[PDB]
Write a protein that binds this DNA or RNA. Structure first.
Ligand SMILES: Nc1ncnc2c1ncn2[C@@H]1O[C@H](COP(=O)(O)OP(=O)(O)O)[C@@H](O)[C@H]1O
Ligand SMILES: [Mg+2]
Lengths: 754, 788
DNA sequence: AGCTGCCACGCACCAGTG
DNA sequence: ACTGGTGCATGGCAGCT
């Protein structure tokens, strides 16, 4: 095998698998890497088995690697951004492709979901907005121009794919895009005056087409994500809020873990999207609130039926790409059968948007009857070996199967004919690809074979024979099986012809069913978790009553202590002093999350929630350097509609430098920015603020001392903290009695002055 | 799911269930014919872990029995998959002969593979120890024992408190941890891998003594210095009872156990071991560790030894001065020894497999290759004037007799296993050459018989072949087969050939198949017989491997001391550290901007330095290098400096900044002594302004006045620069920085005195806090500055 | 070279016969 | 109590395109 590096040249940046019997083997830096990612030995060659290529392809793909299969030439290529088989895809997690680039004016950006067809473009102006979008969208594969100057954004990222500047050319991209969608201009989509981002979507759509070498009819539209259509959240804020991802890397004890009790995978992906994309436009919010309130009674009724629909989104993608396997068509049929029950249940629900999803759902009765008659109840995984088309769908196929079936029934009778004639109880008719049909006597009885029996194969304890009669029916069976298997393949391709016309309507359905799932779910969550419906006010403000952390109340097992919040423009900054130990931090995060959820359209963890409009949520809660950097970002971009959450800035540098930076930040946020702010500090000197300025108030956390421990209470109440707790804590940790005594003396000395 | 009494099973399952019952909690591979099998839930679990099909075995006792299995010849692949997941596997083989057996063939469990007892090349990592350990707790302290099962190293220790015990777990890092059912402090142990809850009786003391004594061939354990250590003996007894349960052979390489005393070595808490990144960085990787920079050893047994020394610095003034000499003496000779030393290889673990009677042909070949480098190492080391080196030349041995044994017994490149023969060589056993030479009736019978029969019959398709199932045969094509002598006896028929047998070939077939089986078994006798001849000299061989490893370590530390430019430190009587132009041995190599070397001077009258200076200044580095230079000087290595003078050091502590933070400080305050080196990297954490500092101030005083330890005490609290004024023994140093207005400047140089100003705003402005806010903070700061 | 399906094997599960 | 023949996990490799 000298001649194989000649195929490595064809695409160097992609790891090359190479058939070598029943395995795929790799060379050079494609071995070093493939052992460090997948875990396999390094003889420089590594290799996976053929029985689990899909397993090992998905793990490479999920680590942001394209693979190329070789069997000789390159027959297949998978890439992180463009896979659509259900074996390479995490069920409840979006898998986006993306392109990014940079003008002398700003950035362009586009994500594709190659299964839903969800195509978005944006145009981030500064680089922090850009980074926010990268964290949020979190694409499996990023395309980017060499051009690209600001490499620190995408520097450490899976699936980077360097593209030439000419692929990002505007005019070429407008056409390719207009051709894809069947429009003359891109005005129906809202993006015709949005060139930077159009150039990203141009590069992406062209890369996508290349990975598939097929039409992508399911991609029929594009939307632009505006900035002022959304509560902007920096990456450090999405991390600290643990919306979808705990700081620990995974998915436990996160907002989605508690709010996401949807019943279809497509509903789960959509909700997680909604949770990362709070919208500022109350019209849609009041629309969601009202739907959620309407479907509350109907939740037990709807969800068992909705669960049956399954992941129709991703199935429909495999219809669009013409790769759907028999079970895919079978689940599409199963889903269709739910639609009359879903439409019946939803019919009396008094909401305009629920009835609109009801219509959007469709019924598709013809396609239900088509697949009911065309496919058997539980068809094999593949079409390969037939057994998928139903009985009595195609009169011709039935004749062929009966010619086979009856030729096979002859050979069974041949068995019993030969058994009765020869009187040899071990006689049997078997079948095998190497020999066709055969009579088999055992070795003990083989010497008494009739002398018309032609010998063919000697086993250890048996002999095999053919006779003219046998081989006659071998043909009868095999031509009838071969023709019926050909008619099945053709009739299966004909089901795509009948299904594909209604591809658009089908995509509408799956989307409606994916939104019904989200809205019914959020409905169940509100009712089941004692949430209430928040109202919106004209000027900024957050009035909360007995509010809670939506996760911590569910995840811990101690009684969760609820608190109020009163932020108006006449009271826009609380100085939270006292012990933290999770208490302040929790109070602050439950504020953001409550706000986050009002603006997702969900009910919220509280007795009452009024809330003015919010444009950004900053949460600096988690070097001194990093703290000051995240603080710099708030002070540079916070507005008077911003929600700002600050966790004890100053620790990590000198008392005075730190006290002086806290003082100046709180001042700057109360007086200049005027953001609604929870400024959690430890500096007691900072409680003198509410006197020195308008619109600042003091609240605090306390601790109660009992027995020989201490209970860190979680009730925020008015006034400054009037106690400290580090000596008390050290005492209980068993720092020498005398040390603490001297510490208490020092502590008094130091306070007395200021 | 029926009543499944003894009588309810077949004879096969009765036997399976007795064996399984003596292994209820771990997977049992059960050798049935050509397969290792599993049943009931084990098969269900095996199907999920190993990725094999869950099947069944037909029954007449209710429902069917879940089964899974794997052909015997692939057992090792699957055994690996399980032990890397941390599963024990009991291996049960067939003992008897089925053809002389009424009921089921006899079956013993012959070994148990568990993560800490594995000793095969494929499941272990060249450069990383794989210890079994055993922990146990009393009302007053801990008992703890470790075992490298593939070397014999058997150690015993009796950690005083919870936190020394935490440090020992981190250090030894057992792949498997047997522990007592009554174990109170599960916080130390829960979460670890290879956890094995064990019943109390295994930790019973008189049974420990009896079993340990027995194993070492002694009447008491006085000579080993452990007779006084019942806490730890109880650990040792459980370990050893377990070790022997897993192996089910003698373990003659376990000829000793040693006490690991508090004061024989520098003791580092869990925090210190992590902050100096000795073999693991703070990501779990081995990149940019002390070990990455120092470990250019050529043999694996050397690498592991170096890593143990690094982790346990010895306090013995004599051993250190001798190791220090060995380095200096050997510096000229590394270039020539290192390539030879390499060729010895991993002799430690090869003598393991020899001792365990497991070693394969290629283990014996590499042992023979090792012996073949001792004569070159003997010459090389003679000219090195150093007593310690010549003691290691003597202890390395030579073993010319065994070299000549393996040179005459095994061939140059043997197969992986003896399973299939071809191992033993021509000359070694005369009976063996007789037997091969009959079954080497190749170059012989088959070819001529073929010609003769083709030419006599006149049938050109005629070939002579052998197939494993039908035996030897004469083949004729189907078109010529109706012409074959009526003497030919039809044997195997195919689609297009017929194969036949004649008396002459059948007689050659019985002759060659019995010749080959005889030749195989006698080979296996000869192979096993090498272990009998080798085994006596095992003690001397273990001392060989142990010297070759220490040579690899020292020769390494000498090369490192030349290339990286280190000098020999010297020791003193009272506590103190006096570094001249010292460097962080790791940071100095990763960075490219040359390393700003610094002094340090600790002493009993200058024992606590309060370190000040900016974020990113160099405070932590200056602490870590102090500790590393201590750590290195006390493994006998040379040190990254112009001159180092270091007195004695019992423990090293470390706090690097709630209920666990404070506890960590109490541990320091209670256990530090006048000989301890204490690093506190900005501690002091309260719920208010002055809270945490007040504690740090109180702690500082306590370390200076009461404990009198050598403390490096970096803070951001400027208030602590007043310490030197009040306490005795305290002083102020700082890592310098420069102004230039709008900009940074981190000079990385340590100088006496407090910093001139704290740089919190300068660093805040560098992060990009609005210049407008930095302004108002500077305004506030002179407000605050004007109080004093 | 690729693909199918016989065989390794001790043991248990039948039927068909003492 | 037989005689006799099946039929099994997986992986090696003969037999046959
Ligand atoms: N002696 C030195 N020479 C050159 N660089 C140094 C030196 N000491 C520290 N540094 C650099 O400073 C960085 C941080 O040092 P560090 O001690 O952590 O500052 P801090 O005092 O805030 O802990 C390190 O990453 C290292 O590169
Ligand atoms: Mg530091």
């Amino acid at each position: 095998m000298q001649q194989y590096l000649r195929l490595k040249a064809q695409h160097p940046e992609i790891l090359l698998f190479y058939r070598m019997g029943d395995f795929y083997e790799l060379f050079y830096d494609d071995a070093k890497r493939a052992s460090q990612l997948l875990d396999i030995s390094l003889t420089p060659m590594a290799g996976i088995p053929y029985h689990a290529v899909e397993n090992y392809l998905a793990k490479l793909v999920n680590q942001g690697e394209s693979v190329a299969i070789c069997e000789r030439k390159v027959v297949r290529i998978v890439t992180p951004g463009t896979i659509s088989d259900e074996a390479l895809l995490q069920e409840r997690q979006d898998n986006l492709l993306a392109a990014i680039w940079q003008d002398s004016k700003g950035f362009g950006y586009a994500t594709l979901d190659i299964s839903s067809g969800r195509f978005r473009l944006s145009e981030p102006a500064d680089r922090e907005t850009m980074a926010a979008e990268l964290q949020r969208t979190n694409p499996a594969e990023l395309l980017y121009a060499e051009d690209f100057a600001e490499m620190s954004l995408i520097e450490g990222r899976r699936g980077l794919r360097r593209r030439p500047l000419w692929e990002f050319e505007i005019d070429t991209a407008r056409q390719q895009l207009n051709l894809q969608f069947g429009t003359r201009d891109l005005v129906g989509f809202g993006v015709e005056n949005a060139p930077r981002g159009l150039c990203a979507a141009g590069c992406l759509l062209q890369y996508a087409k290349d990975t598939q070498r097929t039409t992508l009819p399911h991609i029929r539209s594009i939307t632009m994500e505006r900035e002022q259509d959304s509560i902007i959240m920096d990456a450090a804020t999405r991390r600290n809020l643990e919306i979808t991802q705990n700081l620990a890397g995974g998915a436990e004890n996160t907002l989605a873990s508690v709010l996401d009790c949807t019943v279809t995978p497509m509903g789960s992906r959509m909700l997680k999207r909604w949770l990362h994309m709070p919208v500022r436009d109350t019209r849609v919010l009041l629309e969601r609130q009202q739907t959620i309130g309407a479907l509350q009674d109907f939740t037990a009724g709807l969800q068992p039926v909705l669960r049956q629909v399954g992941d129709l989104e991703r199935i429909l993608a495999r219809l669009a790409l013409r790769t759907a396997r028999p079970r895919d068509l079978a689940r599409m049929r199963h889903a269709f059968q739910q639609l009359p029950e879903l439409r019946a249940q939803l019919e009396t629900v008094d909401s305009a948007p629920v009835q609109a999803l009801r219509e959007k759902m469709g019924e598709f009765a013809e396609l239900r009857d088509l697949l009911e008659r065309a496919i058997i109840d539980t068809p094999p995984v593949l079409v390969r070996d037939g057994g998928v088309i139903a009985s009595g769908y195609n009169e011709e196929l039935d004749e062929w199967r009966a010619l086979a079936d009856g030729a096979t029934d002859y050979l069974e009778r041949l068995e019993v004919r030969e058994r009765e004639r020869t009187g040899l109880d071990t006689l049997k008719v078997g079948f095998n690809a190497v020999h066709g049909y055969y009579i088999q006597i055992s070795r003990g009885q083989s010497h008494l074979a009739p002398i018309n029996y032609m010998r063919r194969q000697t086993l250890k304890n048996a002999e095999r024979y053919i006779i003219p009669e046998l081989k006659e029916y071998e043909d009868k069976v095999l031509t009838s099986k071969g023709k019926a298997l050909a008619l099945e393949k053709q009739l299966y391709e004909e089901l795509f012809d009948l299904l594909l016309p209604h591809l658009e309507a089908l995509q509408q359905s799956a989307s409606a069913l994916a939104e019904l799932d989200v809205l019914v779910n959020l409905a169940e969550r509100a009712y089941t978790l004692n949430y209430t419906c928040p109202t919106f006010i004209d000027k900024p403000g957050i009035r909360i009553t007995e509010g809670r952390h939506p996760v911590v109340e569910q995840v811990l097992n101690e009684p969760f202590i609820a608190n109020p919040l009163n932020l108006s423009p006449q009271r826009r900054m609380l100085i939270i002093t006292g012990p933290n130990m999770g208490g302040k931090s929790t109070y602050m995060r439950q504020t953001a999350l409550i706000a986050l959820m009002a603006y997702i359209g969900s009910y919220v963890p509280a007795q009452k929630v009024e809330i003015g409009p919010i444009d950004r949520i900053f949460t600096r809660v988690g070097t001194f350097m990093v703290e000051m950097t995240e603080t710099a970002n708030i002070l540079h971009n916070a507005t008077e509609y911003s929600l700002v959450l600050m966790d004890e800035i100053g620790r990590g540098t000198s008392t005075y430098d730190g006290l002086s930076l806290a003082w100046a930040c709180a001042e700057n946020l109360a007086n200049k920015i005027k953001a609604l702010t929870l400024f959690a500090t430890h500096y007691f000197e900072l409680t003198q603020l509410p006197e020195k300025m308008e619109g600042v108030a003091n609240v605090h956390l306390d601790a109660l001392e009992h027995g020989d421990t201490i209970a860190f209470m979680h009730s925020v109440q008015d006034g400054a903290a009037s106690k400290s707790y580090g000596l008390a804590v050290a005492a209980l940790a068993g720092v020498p009695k005398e040390v603490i005594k001297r510490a208490r003396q020092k502590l008094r000395e130091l306070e007395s002055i200021s």
